[PDB]
């Protein structure tokens, strides 16, 4: 049904529709408290997010019980409560903006194309959008990018119809390259610089925490393992199983909004309210850490 967007029909959709698992309240309470300890005691924390952190906004995931691939695989279409334009950042989106402001998040690697991290105000220089961003187009000639307020209008790295305006020939001519969407199709190369930065942050983290991804798509799904190579720790947060459950130092099965609400509570940090779509290109210097909670 996605083709349509003229996307490849030859993808391997992975394991779709596995049962959800829910930790009982007491265990969960225990786990989120342990998470806070890890986040406070680690000096370099990298988060990795997937489609599961945008479900509370009305965007479906891919392989959940009602995921877009899960439904397709069984001959059904999925259902969209919201458009990408009208989607609102969730409490988890807003929590990550705050973590970064206070220095508790070194970097954020996302697989999501819904544009919400950017639109929530998350600074672009701490973010790798490894699979693209429905609001971003890019010059085929010169790689310069343009962030738009509306979706760019194609997927699969196709010409959007606009042209590049960067200055060429010592100021005499415009680039005029075709702008293209940045939505990777199946088996496209990841963007070099986002991957190189995501890889660097993952290899250097001493804590990687995954949120709302079943980790089945590489290489983004393999980045949280890099941390374990230097003896850092891995935390997986997800309702379904994930491909790398056996490497987790801490596994939490619960709703991300609920997990991040509590985490912030233990950390002493309010979750900012969202004003509306606001692009921040570069991080501010860090606000000071809150009073040591433990």
């Amino acid at each position: 049904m996605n083709y349509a967007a003229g996307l490849s029909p030859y993808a391997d959709k992975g394991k779709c529709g596995l049962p959800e698992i829910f930790d009982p309240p007491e265990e969960l309470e225990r786990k989120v408290w342990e998470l806070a300890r890890l986040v406070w005691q680690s000096s370099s924390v990298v988060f990795h997010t997937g489609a599961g952190i945008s479900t509370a906004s009305g965007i479906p995931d891919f392989r959940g019980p009602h995921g877009v691939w899960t439904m397709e695989e069984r001959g059904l279409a999925p259902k969209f409560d919201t458009t990408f334009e009208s989607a609102r950042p969730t409490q988890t989106h807003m929590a990550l903006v705050q973590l970064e402001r206070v220095g508790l998040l070194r970097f954020l690697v996302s697989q999501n194309v819904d544009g919400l991290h950017v639109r929530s105000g998350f600074p672009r220089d701490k973010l790798a959008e490894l699979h693209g961003n429905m609001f971003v187009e890019e010059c085929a000639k010169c790689k310069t990018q343009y962030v738009r307020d509306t979706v760019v209008g194609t997927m699969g790295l196709k010409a959007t119809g606009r042209l590049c305006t960067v200055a060429k020939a010592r100021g005499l001519r415009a680039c005029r390259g075709e702008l293209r969407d940045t939505i990777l199709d199946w088996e496209d190369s990841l963007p070099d610089r986002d991957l190189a930065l995501a890889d660097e942050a993952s290899r250097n983290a001493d804590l990687s925490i995954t949120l709302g991804t079943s980790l089945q798509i590489r290489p983004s799904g393999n980045l949280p393992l890099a941390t374990k190579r230097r003896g850092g720790r891995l935390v997986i947060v997800n309702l379904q199983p994930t491909k790398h459950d056996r490497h987790a130092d801490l596994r939490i099965h619960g709703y991300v909004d609920e997990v991040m609400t509590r985490l912030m509570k233990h950390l002493g940090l309010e979750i900012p309210a969202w004003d509306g779509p606001r692009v921040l290109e570069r991080a501010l210097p860090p606000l000071p850490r809150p009073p040591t909670p433990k």
Binding site: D185, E187, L190, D192, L195, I217, R218, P219, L225
Partner: peptide, 12 residues
């Protein structure tokens, strides 16, 4: 070394 394409597979 090893590919940087969006797909399903190992990390080794």
């Amino acid at each position: 070394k090893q590919t940087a394409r969006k797909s399903t597979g190992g990390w080794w």
